[PDB]
Amino acid sequence: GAGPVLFAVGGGSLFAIHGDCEAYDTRTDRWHVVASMSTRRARVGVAAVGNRLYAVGGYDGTSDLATVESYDPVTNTWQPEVSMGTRRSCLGVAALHGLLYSAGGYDGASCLNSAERYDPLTGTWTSVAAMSTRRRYVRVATLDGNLYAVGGYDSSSHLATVEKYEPQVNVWSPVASMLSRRSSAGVAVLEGALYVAGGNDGTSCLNSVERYSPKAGAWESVAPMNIRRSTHDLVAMDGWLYAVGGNDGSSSLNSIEKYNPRTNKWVAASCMFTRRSSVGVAVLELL
Numbered sequence: 001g002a003g004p005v006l007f008a009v010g011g012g013s014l015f016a017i018h019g020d021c022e023a024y025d026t027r028t029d030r031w032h033v034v035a036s037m038s039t040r041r042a043r044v045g046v047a048a049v050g051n052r053l054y055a056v057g058g059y060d061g062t063s064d065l066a067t068v069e070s071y072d073p074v075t076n077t078w079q080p081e082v083s084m085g086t087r088r089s090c091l092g093v094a095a096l097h098g099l100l101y102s103a104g105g106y107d108g109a110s111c112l113n114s115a116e117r118y119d120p121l122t123g124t125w126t127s128v129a130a131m132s133t134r135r136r137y138v139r140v141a142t143l144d145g146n147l148y149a150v151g152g153y154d155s156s157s158h159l160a161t162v163e164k165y166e167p168q169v170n171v172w173s174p175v176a177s178m179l180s181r182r183s184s185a186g187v188a189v190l191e192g193a194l195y196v197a198g199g200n201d202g203t204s205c206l207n208s209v210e211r212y213s214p215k216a217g218a219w220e221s222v223a224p225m226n227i228r229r230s231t232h233d234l235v236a237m238d239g240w241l242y243a244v245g246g247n248d249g250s251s252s253l254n255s256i257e258k259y260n261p262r263t264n265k266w267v268a269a270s271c272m273f274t275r276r277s278s279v280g281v282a283v284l285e286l287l
């Protein structure tokens with residue numbers, strides 16, 4: 001065998017919030033329309049847990065959502081799940097030891113530093129230790145058994161700071177700060193390194209990319225993307241990085257580019273049907 005399939009869920013465009021979804025087949029470089037969600041969700045957290053898709057929170061054009069829904073690729077369908085304790089748009093979402101974490105975001109009034117976790121067996125959310133920082137527009141990714149919360153926006157500054165959640169003790173700890181301030185960046189783990197691509201640093205949309213090694217605890221610059229992207233998403237697929245959707249500062253992107261770390265190079269791929277900024281992305285193993 002089963003191969004990786006990329007899923008672009010929700011997002012927005014000019015004056016639009018999407019509920020539709022599409023899937024990218026790496027073998028054929030082709031996109032396929034898949035089941036639409038029950039709710040329109042942009043700025044949604046999307047994570048794969050148990051080879052099932054979870055769309056967490058988001059913004060439906062009027063409200064910041066607490067609701068969650070789930071995608072079954074076998075039947076190609078979505079279903080409701082238990083809602084979070086907080087409404088969260090612009091959040092980070094990741095899978096860790098089989099549990100689904102939601103960190104940071106915006107509840108309609110404040111930038112959140114809180115976090116909670118979902119056990120899909122019991123369908124239950126429990127709060128977890130809060131981050132040291134309010135992190136709107138945060139991204140979250142799992143590396144070596146820890147959660148990494150990357151950049152974001154407290155109510156006033158764009159952040160270059162990073163935290164990591166240790167679940168053995170339920171504690172957030174600082175991580176070396178990135179070389180750049182970034183909100184709405186794309187974040188993904190590839191061959192043991194945490195890649196952060198694009199984002200907005202408070203001044204412009206970024207095409208720069210950096211990566212973090214936990215062994216050293218150090219950040220290192222990497223080839224920039226071909227297109228400046230904020231609110232896009234980043235995912236690891238079959239040895240490559242895929243940067244999906246986002247915004248170049250004016251137009252919502254349907255563009256896709258992929259990063260080969262052996263050549264340190266970015267190359268375009270087949271673009272989506274829909275333009276999706278603040279899009280959720282995840283990878284399933286399917287055959």
Ligand SMILES: [Cl-]
Nearest residue numbers: 034073074076
């Ligand atoms: Cl399918």
Ligand SMILES: [Cl-]
Nearest residue numbers: 090184231278
């Ligand atoms: Cl976002």
Ligand SMILES: [Cl-]
Nearest residue numbers: 142143144145
């Ligand atoms: Cl890992």
Ligand SMILES: [Cl-]
Nearest residue numbers: 156157158202
């Ligand atoms: Cl700032």
Ligand SMILES: [Cl-]
Nearest residue numbers: 160179180181
């Ligand atoms: Cl600075």
Ligand SMILES: [Cl-]
Nearest residue numbers: 188189235236
């Ligand atoms: Cl990833």
Ligand SMILES: [Cl-]
Nearest residue numbers: 238239240260
């Ligand atoms: Cl390859």
Ligand SMILES: [Cl-]
Nearest residue numbers: 251252253254
């Ligand atoms: Cl375009």
Ligand code: NA
Nearest residue numbers: 126127128170
């Ligand atoms: Na806990």
Ligand code: NA
Nearest residue numbers: 214215216217
């Ligand atoms: Na270290």
Ligand code: NA
Nearest residue numbers: 026238240258
């Ligand atoms: Na490839």
